[PDB]
């Protein structure tokens, strides 16, 4: 529950009552379903999780009419879905996963012109444009090549099943950068634009004396992998 | 009749316990995938072949024309033989997505070209249906009969979900047999009639049928509403007359105990039916024979082939026919680690 | 919310009453029937418009996830 505003009686707009001071605690959090399957088999993962689609999409016409505070009281429903990683992100969209050519879930740059242009950019995509272009893959109203009719819909190939807001993660953004600092120290260390072409050796080298300079200073023995503190 | 034991060697988690094999125009297709199309294939299908029991499977490519198809998860295949017009035909209708949805549209698949280095590509037309048009279910059957002389399609069986009514978040996974209706799908144009049959009760599912010479025979049919494995076996006998398209039936004394069955051509008629079940615990083990000619479907057990301890002890099972008495089946593979290949293969060969 | 056992709880509630009590903790059996009003599937509510293809008792508790899931062995299991 995030948070929690007010409308009646008009002419304002939400007033805000109660708005979460804590959101990223664990212990708010509610746990509605759990299973014993993977998130890979798309097949089982909608069998089980359907229902629960069809309650979300069911319940943003209605109004919710509840004994609060003494008195039936009636309600409406904003649903933010922010908190899925973009493996999820991606597969629950259609999308194809993860070093594609389309690199960002919400505009249309390839990798190629991801480094191009860095900046200059609009947000593009949602959930109906993604259910549109599905059919300009499924129908095929143009007869393109397989290539070209991936280009129409800029990568738009699998159905989406589900809606989620548009939205970045926090945290798994300071991991991604925080795993990328720490690969370009372990090449700053050694001669990466010196020698444009090192081996493995070397990385594993420049890792161990990476590793020994960052036990004797900070005191932070390595990780196998880089835990959201650590790389705090 | 012998079993061989075939090892996939690479990119076998691709395979789902519910699958295709069309066999047209030399090799024999693999269609139905694990998940979504990976962009290590954009279309979904595959060329498998066996050598020295090596699975290997090839990627497919469509055609520049040709619409773009979801993998359908137990649809009903449909041979149409070579003529005119585009031979040869293989219409395939409807199946589940690799999201759990129902497909009620109808794909018409054919070959194109090869080579150019052996490689052959393949072409889907959507056909519409005018309707009438059958509503999204799974486990049906479709046959193809020519019928003095055109020729028709027949569609009929297969369970279904819920109505949209009745459609509750606690019955979502239920499925129901829809009711049992016959519906008559000309290939061209998207004219599809719905009839009625008396003597059909009710609806089944996973009951193979046969057609030759505008008629059909079907086996097997496991009722989920009375939970029965009929034994008996049903005929219908259509013709085409224009405008209308009369159609009756008759029920025969035996039939048998099957649901879920890998029938296999072997002669112009012959078949040997491998099965998949006798009982809801009890698998079907025992090979049988069946040809079918004017007179009716003649019927001949088999000596199976002896099953390893594994495959005989196996919970479930399933498979496919690569066609001509020789067959294709994978079981559910148990280890630990998980191997994680789950499913082990034999080659099946009649004679 | 300390990972507490049903067992290890009555122990300490024998325990603590036994000694000096004046029990303090409450037994089992009524934490047992003082949380269903914590639990889903207590309070009376009602969605105007009717949801869609939602069943109107309001009670429902835990409910297994598979959804009426048509069991027999020979369909996807
Ligand atoms: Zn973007």
Redesign the pocket.
């Given at each position: 529950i995030m948070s929690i505003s007010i409308r009646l009686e008009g002419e304002d707009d939400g007033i805000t009552i109660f708005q979460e001071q804590k959101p990223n605690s664990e212990l708010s959090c509610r746990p509605l379903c759990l299973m014993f399957v993977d998130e890979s088999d798309h097949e089982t993962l909608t069998a089980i999780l359907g229902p629960v689609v069809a309650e979300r999409k069911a319940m943003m016409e209605s109004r919710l009419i509840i004994s609060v505070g003494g008195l039936l009281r009636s309600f409406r429903f904003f649903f933010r879905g922010t908190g899925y990683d973009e493996k999820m992100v991606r597969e629950m969209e259609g999308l194809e996963a993860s070093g594609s050519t389309y690199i960002?879930?919400?505009?249309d740059?390839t990798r190629a012109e991801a480094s191009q242009n860095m900046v200059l950019?609009s947000?593009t995509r949602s959930h109906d444009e993604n259910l549109e272009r599905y059919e300009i893959w499924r129908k095929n109203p143009f007869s393109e090549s397989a290539d070209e009719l991936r280009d129409r819909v800029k990568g738009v190939s699998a159905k989406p099943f589900m809606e989620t807001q548009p939205t970045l993660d926090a945290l798994h953004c300071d991991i991604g950068n925080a795993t990328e600092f720490y690969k370009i120290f372990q090449d700053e260390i050694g001669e990466v634009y010196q020698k444009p072409n090192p081996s493995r050796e070397e990385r594993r080298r420049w890792r161990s004396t990476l590793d020994k300079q960052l036990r004797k200073k900070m005191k932070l023995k390595p990780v196998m992998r880089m835990n959201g503190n650590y790389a705090r | 009749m012998s079993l061989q034991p075939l090892t996939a060697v690479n990119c076998g988690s691709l395979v789902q316990p519910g699958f295709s094999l069309l066999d047209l125009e030399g090799d024999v297709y693999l269609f139905g995938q694990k998940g979504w199309p990976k962009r290590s294939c954009p279309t979904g299908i595959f060329g498998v072949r066996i050598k020295k029991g090596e699975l290997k499977l090839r990627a497919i490519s469509f055609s520049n024309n040709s619409s773009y198809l979801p993998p359908l998860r137990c649809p009903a295949i449909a041979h149409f033989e070579a003529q005119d017009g585009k031979p040869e035909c293989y219409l395939i209708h409807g199946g589940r997505t690799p999201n759990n949805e129902l497909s009620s549209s109808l794909y018409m698949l054919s070959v194109d070209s090869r080579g150019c280095n052996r490689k052959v590509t393949l072409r889907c037309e959507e056909k519409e249906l005018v309707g009438d048009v059958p509503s999204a279910r799974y486990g049906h059957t479709l046959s193809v009969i020519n019928s003095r002389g055109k020729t028709a399609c027949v569609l009929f069986g297969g369970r279904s979900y819920m109505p949209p009514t009745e459609r509750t978040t606690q019955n979502w996974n239920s499925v129901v047999d829809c009711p049992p209706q016959v519906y008559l799908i000309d290939l061209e144009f998207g004219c599809c009639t719905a009839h009625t049959l008396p003597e059909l009760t009710d609806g089944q599912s996973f009951h193979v049928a046969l057609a030759r010479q505008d008629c059909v025979y079907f086996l097997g049919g496991h009722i989920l509403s009375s939970d029965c494995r009929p034994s008996r076996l049903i005929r219908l006998h259509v013709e085409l007359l224009l405008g209308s398209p009369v159609l009756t039936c008759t029920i025969l004394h035996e039939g048998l105990t099957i649901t879920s069955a890998i029938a296999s051509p072997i002669g112009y008629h012959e078949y040997i039916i491998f099965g998949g079940y006798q009982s809801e615990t009890q698998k079907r083990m025992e090979c049988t024979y069946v040809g079918l000619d004017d007179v009716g479907v003649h019927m001949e057990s088999r000596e199976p082939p002896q099953w390893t301890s594994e495959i005989s002890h196996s919970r479930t099972w399933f498979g496919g026919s690569l066609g001509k008495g020789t067959a294709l089946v994978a079981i559910p593979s148990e280890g630990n680690p998980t191997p994680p290949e789950a499913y082990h293969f034999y080659q099946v060969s009649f004679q | 919310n300390t990972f507490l056992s049903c067992s290890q709880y009555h122990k300490m509630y024998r325990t603590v009453k036994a000694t000096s009590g004046r029990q303090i903790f409450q037994p089992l059996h009524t934490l047992r029937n003082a949380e269903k009003e914590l639990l889903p599937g207590f309070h009376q509510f009602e969605w105007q418009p009717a949801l869609k293809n939602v069943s109107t008792s309001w009670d429902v508790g835990i409910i297994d996830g598979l959804s009426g899931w048509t069991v027999s062995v020979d369909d996807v299991p």
């Amino acid at each position: 529950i995030m948070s929690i505003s007010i409308r009646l009686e008009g002419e304002d707009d939400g007033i805000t009552i109660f708005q979460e001071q804590k959101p990223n605690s664990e212990l708010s959090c509610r746990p509605l379903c759990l299973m014993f399957v993977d998130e890979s088999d798309h097949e089982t993962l909608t069998a089980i999780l359907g229902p629960v689609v069809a309650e979300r999409k069911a319940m943003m016409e209605s109004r919710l009419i509840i004994s609060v505070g003494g008195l039936l009281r009636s309600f409406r429903f904003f649903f933010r879905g922010t908190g899925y990683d973009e493996k999820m992100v991606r597969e629950m969209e259609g999308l194809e996963a993860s070093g594609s050519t389309y690199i960002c879930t919400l505009c249309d740059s390839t990798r190629a012109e991801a480094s191009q242009n860095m900046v200059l950019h609009s947000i593009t995509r949602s959930h109906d444009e993604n259910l549109e272009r599905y059919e300009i893959w499924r129908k095929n109203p143009f007869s393109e090549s397989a290539d070209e009719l991936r280009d129409r819909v800029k990568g738009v190939s699998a159905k989406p099943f589900m809606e989620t807001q548009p939205t970045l993660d926090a945290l798994h953004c300071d991991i991604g950068n925080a795993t990328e600092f720490y690969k370009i120290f372990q090449d700053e260390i050694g001669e990466v634009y010196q020698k444009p072409n090192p081996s493995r050796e070397e990385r594993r080298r420049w890792r161990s004396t990476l590793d020994k300079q960052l036990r004797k200073k900070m005191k932070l023995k390595p990780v196998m992998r880089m835990n959201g503190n650590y790389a705090r | 009749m012998s079993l061989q034991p075939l090892t996939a060697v690479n990119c076998g988690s691709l395979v789902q316990p519910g699958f295709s094999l069309l066999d047209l125009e030399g090799d024999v297709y693999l269609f139905g995938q694990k998940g979504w199309p990976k962009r290590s294939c954009p279309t979904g299908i595959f060329g498998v072949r066996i050598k020295k029991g090596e699975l290997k499977l090839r990627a497919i490519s469509f055609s520049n024309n040709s619409s773009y198809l979801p993998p359908l998860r137990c649809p009903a295949i449909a041979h149409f033989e070579a003529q005119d017009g585009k031979p040869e035909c293989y219409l395939i209708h409807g199946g589940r997505t690799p999201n759990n949805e129902l497909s009620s549209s109808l794909y018409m698949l054919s070959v194109d070209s090869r080579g150019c280095n052996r490689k052959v590509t393949l072409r889907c037309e959507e056909k519409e249906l005018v309707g009438d048009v059958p509503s999204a279910r799974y486990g049906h059957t479709l046959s193809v009969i020519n019928s003095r002389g055109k020729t028709a399609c027949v569609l009929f069986g297969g369970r279904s979900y819920m109505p949209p009514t009745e459609r509750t978040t606690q019955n979502w996974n239920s499925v129901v047999d829809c009711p049992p209706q016959v519906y008559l799908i000309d290939l061209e144009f998207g004219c599809c009639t719905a009839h009625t049959l008396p003597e059909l009760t009710d609806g089944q599912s996973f009951h193979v049928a046969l057609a030759r010479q505008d008629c059909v025979y079907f086996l097997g049919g496991h009722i989920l509403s009375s939970d029965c494995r009929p034994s008996r076996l049903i005929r219908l006998h259509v013709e085409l007359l224009l405008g209308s398209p009369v159609l009756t039936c008759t029920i025969l004394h035996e039939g048998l105990t099957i649901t879920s069955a890998i029938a296999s051509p072997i002669g112009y008629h012959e078949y040997i039916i491998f099965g998949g079940y006798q009982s809801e615990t009890q698998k079907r083990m025992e090979c049988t024979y069946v040809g079918l000619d004017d007179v009716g479907v003649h019927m001949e057990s088999r000596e199976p082939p002896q099953w390893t301890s594994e495959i005989s002890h196996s919970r479930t099972w399933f498979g496919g026919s690569l066609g001509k008495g020789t067959a294709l089946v994978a079981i559910p593979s148990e280890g630990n680690p998980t191997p994680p290949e789950a499913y082990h293969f034999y080659q099946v060969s009649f004679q | 919310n300390t990972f507490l056992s049903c067992s290890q709880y009555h122990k300490m509630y024998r325990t603590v009453k036994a000694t000096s009590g004046r029990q303090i903790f409450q037994p089992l059996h009524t934490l047992r029937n003082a949380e269903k009003e914590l639990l889903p599937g207590f309070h009376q509510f009602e969605w105007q418009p009717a949801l869609k293809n939602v069943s109107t008792s309001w009670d429902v508790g835990i409910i297994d996830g598979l959804s009426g899931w048509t069991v027999s062995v020979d369909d996807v299991p």
